[PDB]
Structures are given as C-alpha cells and as structure tokens.
Assembly symmetry: C2
C-alpha cells in the first residue's frame, strides 16, 4: 500500500462497531481492512455502516441486480478493489455463476434483458468523472423502473461513490479471495 | 429543465420526520436542495445519508474552511458542477474571506493556501477522478502535514462527495439561482 499513515485497528479493540463489521462481512465472508481503518472514527463508521445496510434492505429491485449495479459502477469508476469485492459478493450469493461472470458485457451478453441493461448502463454512465448520463439513460430507466426502484438504483451507485473513493484513499490492497474472483471474471 | 422526469421531490411539509436531516444540509447552504427531498421518498436512505452528512460539521481535526474547500475540489475533480456550485456557496456563506474561497480551484499557486492545505486539496482532486490518480507522493505529502485522525476526516469528506456527486448526477439536479451566481463568479 502507498498508505502507511492510516492503519486498521484490531477488531477486538472496537466491540461497539460489531454491527458495522457484521454488515459488511456477512455478504463478503471477511472484514475489509478499510472498514477497520474507518473504525478509528466511530461516528463515521456507524453512520457509513447505517448507509451501507440500506442496500440489503431495498425492496424494489432483486438482490442479483443490486450487486450487478455495484459491480458496474465500481468498474466504471475504475476502482478495481471495489470491483473485486462486489464481484465476490455477487458470486457468493448468485445461483447463476455464468450471468455474474458476463456482467461487464451486460450490453451484448444474452444473460441480461433490456431492463437490466437500462439499470447497468445508467450505473456505468453515473460513475465516471464526469458523469456521462444522457437523456437516453433516463428515458430507458423510466421505461423499465418505478420511481421507487430508480431511487434504490441511484442509491447503490451513490454508496459505491463513497466506497470507491474511500478505498482509493486507503489504497486498500485486493485480498486473495476477491483477487481470485476478479481474475476469473477478467 | 432536468433530463430526469421519473423521480420528483416531495413537498417539504410532506416529510417533517426528516427535518433533522434537512436542517443539517440547509443550515450551511441557506435552502433545502431538491435532491434531498427526492431522497426523502426512501426514509431509510434519507436518515442514513443525513446521519453521514452531519459527520462533516462534527469533524474536529481539520478547520471548517478546509472541510468545504475539500468538498469543492473533490466535486470539481469529479466534474459535478451542481455539487461544485453548492460547496462553493457553502464555503462563501461560512468563510470570512471571500477572496480565499474564490481562489480555491487555483489552490496550488494561490498565496491564500499554505502547503498543508495544498496537500489535502491535491489529495482530494486525485481521489475524486475516474479512475483515482492518487500516487505515492499524494500519500507522502498528506502524512507530512496531517495526523491519522485528520487524514480519515479528509478521506471521509471526499467519500461523502462521492455519494453526492453521483446522487445529484442521477437526479440531474439543476443548479439553483443562488449557487449559480456563486459558480459564475468563481469561474
């Protein structure tokens, strides 16, 4: 890591944050060092933890699409760390391995329908610097999703906004397990 | 107007439970952005994000002027003109020295900014592009001028801008007249 200034605490040092830690590792299998670093500001960790748990609680889009959005957003933003993690989450939860592995080709892969493509294209366009969302992105989203659903899609992308920048700021190094998933999907 | 016609704001009066969240935002800004009123339609999201955003004012290890300068630079790096206008507007509402705020985007050469500020703002810029272009020097320079505690708060503000830059792009939030004025001046 390029970052030696801000180091993780030991998990046992902050029991109050166990709700936050569990939230993340439940999907992923392990606790990322980036959240242990976040722990050194307990107010921040608890508030971010609260935001992140909103993903699992969302009701208007399927679970498989939730993690696909996070995968594509993270990739568009060029955060390979977050791309590996969300990919790993997607493969841990998904019944259809092939569909997950084709996610980054969603626009031409026949594992994805037009509704999924509308959401994932929006996620891509939303996540670059600058955003390159055009009227078509919005027209297509309106064609296939309710206001409720659109909000949850935007919300996942925005939460990736947080995590993409956070993990870049910590220079989080991709763990062996996510790395395996990432090599396979690439 | 906006490219987004699907997801519209509720009226402020419709969601009084969110007033704590709204106050956090508008206290600095002078008004409640439509983007937060749209966020209101998902109470879990609004409360959680509101909680996260209030962390900025509560941060203790960096000055207030630097907090909003970071958010300005991050938002600009990310090419979100909406968030750039807002944080600029916040910075002019809270800053005693209007000229220092107006020179923020030239922080690397403006005399209003010291090396500590430049280290933080350069980190904020590099952190906020797609992809991030943080290099070892960004980290070395941050370590030179900031504690671990401070670095976390800097990263946190940038990351929160991550959320807001993308959120306001997803709503295609249109820049309000007052922020617009601030933005025209600062360019």
């Amino acid at each position: 890591s390029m970052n030696t200034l801000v180091t993780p605490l030991q998990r046992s040092d902050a029991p109050q944050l166990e709700p936050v830690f569990r939230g993340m590792e439940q999907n992923l299998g392990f606790l990322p060092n980036g959240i242990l670093t976040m722990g050194k500001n307990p107010d921040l960790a608890v508030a971010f933890g609260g935001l992140f748990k909103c993903i699992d609680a969302f009701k208007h889009i399927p679970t498989e699409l939730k993690w696909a959005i996070a995968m594509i957003s993270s990739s568009a933003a060029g955060c390979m760390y977050c791309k590996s993690h969300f990919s790993h989450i997607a493969t841990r939860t998904h019944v259809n391995r092939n569909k997950v592995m084709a996610a980054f080709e969603f626009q031409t892969s026949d594992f994805y329908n037009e509704a999924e493509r509308a959401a994932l294209a929006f996620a891509f366009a939303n996540s670059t610097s600058p955003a390159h969302l055009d009227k078509e992105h919005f027209d297509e989203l309106a064609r296939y999703y309710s206001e409720e659903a659109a909000i949850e899609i935007a919300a996942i992308i925005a939460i990736c906004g947080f995590l993409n920048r956070w993990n870049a700021a910590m220079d989080s190094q991709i763990e062996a397990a996510p790395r395996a998933t990432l090599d396979e999907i690439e």
